[PDB]
Design a protein around this nucleic acid. Sequence first.
DNA 1: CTGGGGTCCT
DNA 2: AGGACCC
Length: 379
Amino acid sequence: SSRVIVHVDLDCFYAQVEMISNPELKDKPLGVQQKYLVVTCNYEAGKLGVKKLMNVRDAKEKCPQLVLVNGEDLTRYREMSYKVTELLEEFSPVVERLGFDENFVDLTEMVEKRLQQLQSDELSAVTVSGHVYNNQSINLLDVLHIRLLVGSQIAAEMREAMYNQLGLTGCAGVASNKLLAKLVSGVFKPNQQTVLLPESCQHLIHSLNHIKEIPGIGYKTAKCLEALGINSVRDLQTFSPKILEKELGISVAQRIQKLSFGEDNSPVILSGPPQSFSEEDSFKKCSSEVEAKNKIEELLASLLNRVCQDGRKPHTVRLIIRRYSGRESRQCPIPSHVIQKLGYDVMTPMVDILMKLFRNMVNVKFHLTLLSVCFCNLK
DNA sequence: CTGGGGTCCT
DNA sequence: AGGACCC
Ligand SMILES: Nc1ccn([C@H]2C[C@H](O)[C@@H](COP(=O)(O)NP(=O)(O)OP(=O)(O)O)O2)c(=O)n1
Ligand SMILES: [Mn+2]
Ligand SMILES: [Mn+2]
């Protein structure tokens, strides 16, 4: 009952796409910028001291020759993301999306088929593809080792098909659950892959230096844990289950403490088509209801094109704003006749609705720093 | 000088 | 509606 899971994360995703569009960027330190944030950078810029999510001020301070490309339009990145996901769905149907650039694939059934097609003379010729975490020795008589090696071969075929068909590189990790497959994928970067044999699990789990590095333990949970003297993976491993339950609830406590041991029972879920579409816009200041109406119009145009391309109709609309110096949202169902009309001047009705919601949140009789629109409840 | 997105749970 | 998490 031991699964084989692969996790794939693309190398400097946005920067890789922009480097594909303009090959002249391939040999220069490249950073992809959104507002005042260098959201990612190619390997050249990373060598010169630029890091992901660094200030544009600090990024040019570390590397003044940095070339900057605007990436506030995620259209290309989204297209390429779904091409990667589809290509992986060619291998096994059940592919889970995390972010635009990460995918889990459950290789168990495929691995089993490959092993059944094999015979004894070949069964000793099974070899790993890529790195083995911690240089750990392979025991070809351990069925888990054999299955994970086959999983590494499948992962290699996946990366190669990604480069040949899509011109994209990434790192893969092969393990027995999603947490470990994600934790081991980034050990060797970029454009490499790593397989984790069971014997090294604990090693991996103890190579982390704080609990926030565990997928599942975010900012709030991390701060609450720090408030209890829990700072290492082993602190959380050994901490009292009961105090943990009282401090975080039963759910969070049991899940994250089981995560501290490298145990992740969660299955790989079919992500399928998106559950929502949304567009954002940030600014230093918004003070005019007419200006807010214009920005909202902008968001609506692109969202309408996207939904029209999708072929499904959203049955709920949401408006989100941020106030000066928290985020607030109002949503409502989309009228049925507008839903059927999708594909007339749908603009005007939609703008009227979202303006009504806006007035519900804001008093025209202000200073806003974020306007966002969402289409959810897709059919 | 802190983006532009997504998921699910309450 | 808001909040936790993910990239
Ligand atoms: N907070 C974040 C994190 C990622 N992203 C976008 C930019 C990234 O190119 C893309 C993937 O994020 P990422 O995997 O965390 N780092 P990236 O893939 O750029 O480089 P690697 O570290 O994976 O080589 O999502 C973002 O816009 N905001
Ligand atoms: Mn990633
Ligand atoms: Mn990545």
